[PDB]
Design a binder for this molecule. Structure first.
Ligand code: HEM
Length: 154
């Protein structure tokens, strides 16, 4: 789907994420919750966290951010050949809970924001476009897996 050069830009910046998965995951989740507070409602065990400092101090939130970015990184490294990885994630997101595709757009925005805030020298326009396409592909394929399970993602 993406070109080889696009995937290489995606994985180049992802290598920077891997130097500090926990910190990236905290900042991505906090940006998501700050920018779109309705998403915090989906996490019953994070609802009692009232400030950014409380969110940074929560080991539970930090652990979940690592779980999130580990799954995403594994998907990105498949360079689109990710059906076996996306199916369980769709089930996690469409069965136990109901995570609309729009919420995946919100977290994608937070991912772009944090990557550019931390790594501007390795996340210029071409890299941003590549990551945007990779996350678009992720969201499109997740949406199809949602429908397979009976969830329209709305
Ligand atoms: C890049 C996008 C995302 C990725 C890669 C991702 C990944 C994951 C993973 C790996 C799990 C654990 C699944 C398991 O082990 O059973 C999970 C659970 C969950 N996700 Fe996501 N997630 C993403 C976005 C979101 C968003 C945007 C929301 C809500 C607005 C959300 C809500 C949840 C909830 C509520 C759970 C259950 C966690 C719990 O039981 O405490 N996810 N996610």
């Amino acid at each position: 789907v993406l070109s080889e050069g696009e995937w290489q830009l995606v994985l180049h910046v992802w290598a920077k994420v891997e130097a500090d998965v926990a910190g990236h995951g905290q900042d991505i989740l906090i940006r998501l919750f700050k920018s779109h507070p309705e998403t915090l409602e989906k996490f019953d065990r994070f609802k009692h966290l009232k400030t950014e400092a409380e969110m940074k101090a929560s080991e539970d939130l930090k652990k979940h951010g690592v779980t999130v970015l580990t799954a995403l990184g594994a998907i990105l490294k498949k360079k689109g050949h990710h059906e076996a990885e996306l199916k369980p994630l769709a089930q996690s997101h469409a069965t136990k809970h109901k995570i609309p595709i729009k919420y995946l757009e919100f977290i994608s925005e937070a991912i772009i924001h944090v990557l550019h805030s931390r790594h501007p020298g390795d996340f210029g326009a071409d890299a941003q476009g590549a990551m945007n396409k990779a996350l678009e592909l992720f969201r499109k394929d997740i949406a199809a897996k949602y429908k397979e399970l009976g969830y329209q993602g709305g």
